[PDB]
Design a protein around this nucleic acid. Structure first.
Ligand SMILES: [Ca+2]
Ligand SMILES: [Ca+2]
Ligand SMILES: [Zn+2]
Ligand SMILES: [Zn+2]
Ligand SMILES: [Zn+2]
Ligand SMILES: [Zn+2]
Lengths: 142, 142
DNA sequence: GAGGCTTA
DNA sequence: ATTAAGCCTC
DNA sequence: GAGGCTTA
DNA sequence: ATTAAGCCTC
């Protein structure tokens, strides 16, 4: 446990980043969500408080398509567009025509999220997800 | 049958594009392959002649991952980066660390090709491909 | 008729 | 990261 | 400590 | 098209 200078929550080391950012993963994902929604013209019905309760804690997070844990995904050393090492799971607007909301949000790893893109429906992606999980299972990753 | 001003082959309408380009799909895919290989620093052991025999004809082409026919893929109205309507299947460098060669080339639709990216091996992608095929099968597409 | 491009 | 068809000179 | 970014 | 963590002002 230490304290996030932003939400002031008391959190385990696994809720924080490994590089030089000081805010927690929930705070950072919330700042990204709001900036992305504005830029992309998506609606956002989450408040920070509902989002943070929705996002939960690092050891409980798994991609809702492939099942990979947040630590497992971290171990793949994927890079974001900037491109720094990706260390948390993000949110998929499961209906890609709708915005951010509790009803429309689904936790997804950045690999599944980009695969799904705006091409596959969430149920089509559930089936892709199972195939992706076999890749991970084969690589010795959970 | 009409004649491609480039390879001078006598070809069915389905070997040609629907927009304003005059060269056949084989010729265009060959010009793309050579330009992309140069730009990306990939080797290319195909000659035009071996490539054209490898690429075959439109009605015989199916993605080697998801099984979608070239006409089926055309019916999805995907756009290339330019972005015009995609009307043929391309080649996947199945080992993404190696270049273009008969041994390393595999026919793939642009959807499977981008999914695979440099993330999945060809055998991991075979399993993703089967899941993608179910999406198509469900959409009434072959 | 060929060349060089821009990037979901 | 993976490519792909029409445009706009030459 | 918060803001605005660039894009496999 | 889909997003995501560190940098560099403020
Ligand atoms: Ca999504
Ligand atoms: Ca490929
Ligand atoms: Zn926080
Ligand atoms: Zn996933
Ligand atoms: Zn030709
Ligand atoms: Zn395919």
């Amino acid at each position: 446990m230490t304290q996030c200078p932003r939400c002031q929550r008391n959190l385990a080391a696994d809720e924080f980043y490994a590089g030089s950012s000081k805010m927690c993963k929930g705070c950072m994902t919330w700042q990204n969500l709001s900036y992305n929604a504005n830029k992309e013209g998506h609606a956002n019905t989450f408040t920070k408080a509902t989002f943070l309760a929705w996002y939960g804690l690092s050891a409980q997070r798994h991609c809702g398509y492939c099942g990979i844990s947040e630590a497992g995904f971290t171990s793949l050393h994927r890079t974001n567009p900037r491109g720094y090492h990706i260390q948390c799971l993000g949110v998929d607007r499961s209906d890609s025509f709708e915005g951010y909301s509790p009803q429309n949000a689904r936790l997804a790893c950045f690999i599944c999220n980009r695969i799904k893109s705006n091409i596959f429906s969430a149920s089509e992606m559930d089936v892709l997800g199972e195939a992706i999980s076999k890749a991970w299972h084969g690589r010795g990753i959970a």
